[PDB]
Enzyme design. Structure first.
Site, PDB file in Angstrom:
ATOM      1  N   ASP A   8       0.821  -1.213   0.000  1.00  0.00           N
ATOM      2  CA  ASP A   8       0.000   0.000   0.000  1.00  0.00           C
ATOM      3  C   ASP A   8       0.855   1.262   0.000  1.00  0.00           C
ATOM      4  OD1 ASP A   8      -1.911   1.920   0.289  1.00  0.00           O
ATOM      5  OD2 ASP A   8      -2.418   1.453   2.390  1.00  0.00           O
ATOM      6  N   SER A  55      -0.712  15.527 -12.149  1.00  0.00           N
ATOM      7  CA  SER A  55      -0.982  15.171 -13.530  1.00  0.00           C
ATOM      8  C   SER A  55      -1.232  16.426 -14.365  1.00  0.00           C
ATOM      9  CB  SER A  55      -2.187  14.222 -13.597  1.00  0.00           C
ATOM     10  OG  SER A  55      -2.590  13.983 -14.932  1.00  0.00           O
TER      11      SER A  55
END
Length: 330
Positions: A35, A199
């Protein structure tokens, strides 16, 4: 040194991935959920409340000659999906794919929430976010990666998750045969303890690319792709019959649909998520309403590039003094 381990979907939907981990001496092998959005290595154990164990493999520290109780240490964690666990702490030898760390903090669960009990395939979590998020008190502990880093050939790990198929986590090297083209690297902020990046925009299907900054986290422990409501609405508007259902808890779509792809930007580069990756199947057994793999982050407080996004790429988690993230197509 290096390590290399195969990671395997837990079910036919790729809801999560498990990776075998050797703990203790002799080795006890547990299947952990790696994770990158948390920083605790915790396991089902011989100390876990019996009624909260249902099929998991447990770590029994009393059977490990290298286990030592970390005196006075406790831990307690709550995850974004509302699940939680807590317990005490041992140090022991932990190996992943041939890479061994001695003195790793292994957080032994005394209590786990129902979601964990109900998933027989996940024996615990191995956190790979920054150690500043580790919950051990009163002395915070380091992640497996942080402990291994100095010994690694290069201070990196890579995630290569499969679509409906096994993939690979590598430590200490970049497998140049595992991706196509070049790896594009992008800046990371560690201010919130995550692999947080920005992004450069998105496209839906064959549509034009929209240049827009989307801050979010690369999180292997989250199944879906969570993005701003504007972006998500633009995606689902291209699927006839798709709608946001408050009763179901997100966007659903007719199972008869063919889903468009979704592209996200990494600098000037583009990662394409095929439409099929966005199908999470019937909302309930036998239903013709299917659950979407792109969902709104509104009210989460952060955008999350979870498995839906990451599995479309070869992803480099670069733990150099100034960390960065790399993405390549594959």
């Amino acid at each position: 040194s290096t390590g290399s381990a195969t990671t395997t979907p837990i079910d036919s939907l790729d809801d999560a991935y498990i990776t075998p981990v050797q703990i203790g001496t002799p080795a006890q092998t547990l299947n952990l959920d790696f994770d990158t959005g948390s920083s605790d290595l915790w396991v089902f154990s011989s100390e876990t409340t019996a009624s909260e164990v249902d099929g998991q493999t447990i770590y029994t520290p009393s059977k490990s000659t290298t286990a030592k109780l970390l005196s006075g240490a406790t831990w307690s964690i709550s995850y974004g999906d509302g699940s939680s666990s807590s317990g005490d702490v041992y140090t022991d030898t932990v190996s992943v794919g041939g890479l061994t760390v001695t003195g790793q903090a292994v957080e032994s669960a005394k209590k786990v929430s129902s979601s964990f009990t109900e998933d027989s395939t996940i024996d615990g979590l191995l956190g790979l976010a920054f150690s500043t998020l580790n919950t051990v008190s009163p002395t915070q502990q380091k992640t497996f990666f942080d402990n291994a880093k100095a010994s690694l050939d290069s201070p990196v790990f890579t995630a290569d998750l499969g679509y409906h198929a096994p993939g690979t986590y590598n430590f200490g090297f970049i497998d140049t045969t595992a991706y196509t083209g070049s790896i594009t690297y992008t800046a990371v902020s560690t201010k919130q303890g995550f692999w947080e990046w920005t992004s450069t925009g998105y496209a839906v299907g064959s549509g034009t690319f929209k240049s827009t900054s989307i801050d979010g986290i690369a999180d292997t422990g989250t199944t879906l792709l969570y993005l701003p409501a504007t972006v998500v609405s633009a995606y689902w508007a291209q699927v006839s019959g798709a709608k946001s259902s408050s009763s179901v808890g997100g966007y659903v779509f007719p199972c008869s649909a063919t889903l468009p792809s979704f592209t996200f930007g990494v600098g000037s580069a583009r990662i394409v998520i095929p439409g099929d990756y966005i199908d999470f199947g019937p909302i309930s057994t036998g239903s013709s309403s299917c659950f979407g793999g792109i969902q709104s982050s509104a009210g989460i407080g952060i955008n999350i590039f979870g498995d839906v996004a990451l599995k479309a790429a070869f992803v480099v988690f670069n733990g150099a003094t100034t960390p960065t993230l790399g993405f390549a197509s594959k």
